[PDB]
mmCIF file of all heavy atoms in Angstrom:
data_model
loop_
_atom_site.group_PDB
_atom_site.id
_atom_site.type_symbol
_atom_site.label_atom_id
_atom_site.label_comp_id
_atom_site.label_asym_id
_atom_site.label_seq_id
_atom_site.Cartn_x
_atom_site.Cartn_y
_atom_site.Cartn_z
ATOM 1 N N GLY A 12 -14.225 -15.137 12.721
ATOM 2 C CA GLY A 12 -14.346 -13.816 12.596
ATOM 3 C C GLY A 12 -15.108 -13.151 13.672
ATOM 4 O O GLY A 12 -15.669 -13.859 14.692
ATOM 5 N N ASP A 37 1.350 -8.166 -4.155
ATOM 6 C CA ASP A 37 2.578 -8.170 -3.275
ATOM 7 C C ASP A 37 2.222 -8.538 -1.814
ATOM 8 O O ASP A 37 3.023 -8.416 -0.975
ATOM 9 C CB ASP A 37 3.283 -6.819 -3.413
ATOM 10 C CG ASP A 37 3.656 -6.516 -4.896
ATOM 11 O OD1 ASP A 37 3.894 -7.437 -5.712
ATOM 12 O OD2 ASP A 37 3.810 -5.290 -5.156
ATOM 13 N N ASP A 59 0.283 -21.262 16.376
ATOM 14 C CA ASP A 59 -0.168 -22.547 15.951
ATOM 15 C C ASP A 59 -1.029 -22.516 14.653
ATOM 16 O O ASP A 59 -1.564 -23.468 14.185
ATOM 17 C CB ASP A 59 -0.935 -23.298 17.045
ATOM 18 C CG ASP A 59 -2.288 -22.617 17.485
ATOM 19 O OD1 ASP A 59 -2.657 -21.599 16.931
ATOM 20 O OD2 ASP A 59 -2.937 -23.220 18.339
ATOM 21 N N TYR A 66 -9.460 -12.266 21.034
ATOM 22 C CA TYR A 66 -8.549 -11.229 20.551
ATOM 23 C C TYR A 66 -8.246 -11.375 19.088
ATOM 24 O O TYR A 66 -7.890 -10.359 18.358
ATOM 25 C CB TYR A 66 -7.194 -11.238 21.389
ATOM 26 C CG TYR A 66 -6.307 -10.227 21.345
ATOM 27 C CD1 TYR A 66 -6.498 -9.008 21.922
ATOM 28 C CD2 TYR A 66 -5.146 -10.280 20.571
ATOM 29 C CE1 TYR A 66 -5.681 -7.929 21.745
ATOM 30 C CE2 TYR A 66 -4.304 -9.244 20.470
ATOM 31 C CZ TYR A 66 -4.564 -7.977 21.047
ATOM 32 O OH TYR A 66 -3.826 -6.811 20.931
ATOM 33 N N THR A 129 -21.763 1.245 21.037
ATOM 34 C CA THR A 129 -22.051 1.755 19.664
ATOM 35 C C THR A 129 -21.476 0.931 18.548
ATOM 36 O O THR A 129 -22.027 0.912 17.436
ATOM 37 C CB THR A 129 -21.274 3.152 19.511
ATOM 38 O OG1 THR A 129 -21.634 3.980 20.616
ATOM 39 C CG2 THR A 129 -21.626 3.860 18.155
ATOM 40 N N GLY A 136 -17.327 -5.911 9.690
ATOM 41 C CA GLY A 136 -18.269 -5.537 8.578
ATOM 42 C C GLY A 136 -17.471 -5.557 7.257
ATOM 43 O O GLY A 136 -16.510 -4.676 7.069
ATOM 44 N N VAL A 140 -14.838 -2.773 5.644
ATOM 45 C CA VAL A 140 -13.441 -3.017 5.148
ATOM 46 C C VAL A 140 -13.352 -2.488 3.692
ATOM 47 O O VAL A 140 -12.464 -1.803 3.366
ATOM 48 C CB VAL A 140 -13.124 -4.527 5.190
ATOM 49 C CG1 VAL A 140 -11.833 -4.811 4.603
ATOM 50 C CG2 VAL A 140 -13.055 -4.912 6.611
ATOM 51 N N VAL A 176 -19.031 -4.801 -2.936
ATOM 52 C CA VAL A 176 -18.129 -5.978 -2.308
ATOM 53 C C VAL A 176 -18.999 -6.837 -1.439
ATOM 54 O O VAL A 176 -18.951 -8.126 -1.476
ATOM 55 C CB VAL A 176 -16.909 -5.472 -1.590
ATOM 56 C CG1 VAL A 176 -16.149 -6.557 -0.855
ATOM 57 C CG2 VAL A 176 -16.070 -4.823 -2.700
ATOM 58 N N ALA A 180 -19.467 -10.900 -1.920
ATOM 59 C CA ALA A 180 -19.276 -12.079 -1.173
ATOM 60 C C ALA A 180 -20.522 -12.822 -0.759
ATOM 61 O O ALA A 180 -20.573 -13.954 -0.460
ATOM 62 C CB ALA A 180 -18.599 -11.577 0.245
ATOM 63 N N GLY A 189 -22.581 -0.688 7.427
ATOM 64 C CA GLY A 189 -22.016 -0.982 8.781
ATOM 65 C C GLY A 189 -23.027 -1.721 9.647
ATOM 66 O O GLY A 189 -22.660 -1.928 10.922
ATOM 67 N N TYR A 217 -30.582 17.012 -3.495
ATOM 68 C CA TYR A 217 -29.603 18.067 -3.528
ATOM 69 C C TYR A 217 -30.096 19.354 -2.823
ATOM 70 O O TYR A 217 -29.392 20.135 -2.108
ATOM 71 C CB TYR A 217 -29.285 18.486 -4.982
ATOM 72 C CG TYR A 217 -28.088 19.359 -5.092
ATOM 73 C CD1 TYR A 217 -26.891 18.913 -4.880
ATOM 74 C CD2 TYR A 217 -28.195 20.595 -5.595
ATOM 75 C CE1 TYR A 217 -25.711 19.642 -4.986
ATOM 76 C CE2 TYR A 217 -27.109 21.498 -5.641
ATOM 77 C CZ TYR A 217 -25.870 20.950 -5.385
ATOM 78 O OH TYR A 217 -24.711 21.714 -5.506
ATOM 79 N N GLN A 225 -19.170 21.352 9.698
ATOM 80 C CA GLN A 225 -18.810 20.080 10.311
ATOM 81 C C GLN A 225 -18.652 18.953 9.231
ATOM 82 O O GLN A 225 -19.132 19.014 8.202
ATOM 83 C CB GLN A 225 -19.869 19.577 11.448
ATOM 84 C CG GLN A 225 -21.202 20.350 11.413
ATOM 85 C CD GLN A 225 -22.278 19.990 12.497
ATOM 86 O OE1 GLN A 225 -22.837 18.903 12.416
ATOM 87 N NE2 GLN A 225 -22.524 20.961 13.412
ATOM 88 N N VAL A 230 -19.180 15.531 4.497
ATOM 89 C CA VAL A 230 -18.766 14.464 3.511
ATOM 90 C C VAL A 230 -19.586 13.191 3.778
ATOM 91 O O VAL A 230 -19.870 12.528 2.846
ATOM 92 C CB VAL A 230 -17.256 14.376 3.383
ATOM 93 C CG1 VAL A 230 -16.651 15.675 3.002
ATOM 94 C CG2 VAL A 230 -16.770 13.791 4.672
ATOM 95 N N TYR A 242 -28.064 3.778 -5.730
ATOM 96 C CA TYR A 242 -29.108 2.883 -5.360
ATOM 97 C C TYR A 242 -30.222 2.896 -6.474
ATOM 98 O O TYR A 242 -30.689 1.846 -7.048
ATOM 99 C CB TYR A 242 -29.844 3.152 -3.999
ATOM 100 C CG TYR A 242 -31.083 2.391 -3.728
ATOM 101 C CD1 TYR A 242 -30.875 1.033 -3.374
ATOM 102 C CD2 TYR A 242 -32.344 2.861 -3.967
ATOM 103 C CE1 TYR A 242 -32.013 0.220 -3.095
ATOM 104 C CE2 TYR A 242 -33.467 2.039 -3.692
ATOM 105 C CZ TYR A 242 -33.320 0.772 -3.316
ATOM 106 O OH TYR A 242 -34.267 -0.122 -3.086
ATOM 107 N N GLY A 264 -21.739 -0.750 -10.956
ATOM 108 C CA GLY A 264 -20.333 -0.863 -10.696
ATOM 109 C C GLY A 264 -19.421 -0.542 -11.891
ATOM 110 O O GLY A 264 -18.352 0.091 -11.748
ATOM 111 N N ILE A 266 -20.250 1.486 -14.367
ATOM 112 C CA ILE A 266 -20.319 2.842 -14.648
ATOM 113 C C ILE A 266 -19.505 3.609 -13.755
ATOM 114 O O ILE A 266 -18.770 4.543 -14.126
ATOM 115 C CB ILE A 266 -21.826 3.300 -14.576
ATOM 116 C CG1 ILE A 266 -22.802 2.643 -15.582
ATOM 117 C CG2 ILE A 266 -21.893 4.804 -14.702
ATOM 118 C CD1 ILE A 266 -22.532 2.756 -16.914
ATOM 119 N N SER A 282 -22.451 17.897 -10.144
ATOM 120 C CA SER A 282 -22.775 18.136 -11.503
ATOM 121 C C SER A 282 -21.744 17.399 -12.341
ATOM 122 O O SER A 282 -22.009 16.794 -13.389
ATOM 123 C CB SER A 282 -22.923 19.605 -11.728
ATOM 124 O OG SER A 282 -23.194 19.835 -13.083
ATOM 125 N N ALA A 304 -30.044 6.525 -20.067
ATOM 126 C CA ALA A 304 -31.194 7.232 -19.707
ATOM 127 C C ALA A 304 -31.451 6.985 -18.225
ATOM 128 O O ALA A 304 -31.765 7.947 -17.500
ATOM 129 C CB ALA A 304 -32.502 6.606 -20.426
#
Side-chain angles (χ1 to χ4, degrees):
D37 302 334
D59 69 355
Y66 190 79
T129 308
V140 174
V176 175
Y217 192 72
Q225 15 178 289
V230 301
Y242 172 77
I266 298 299
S282 177

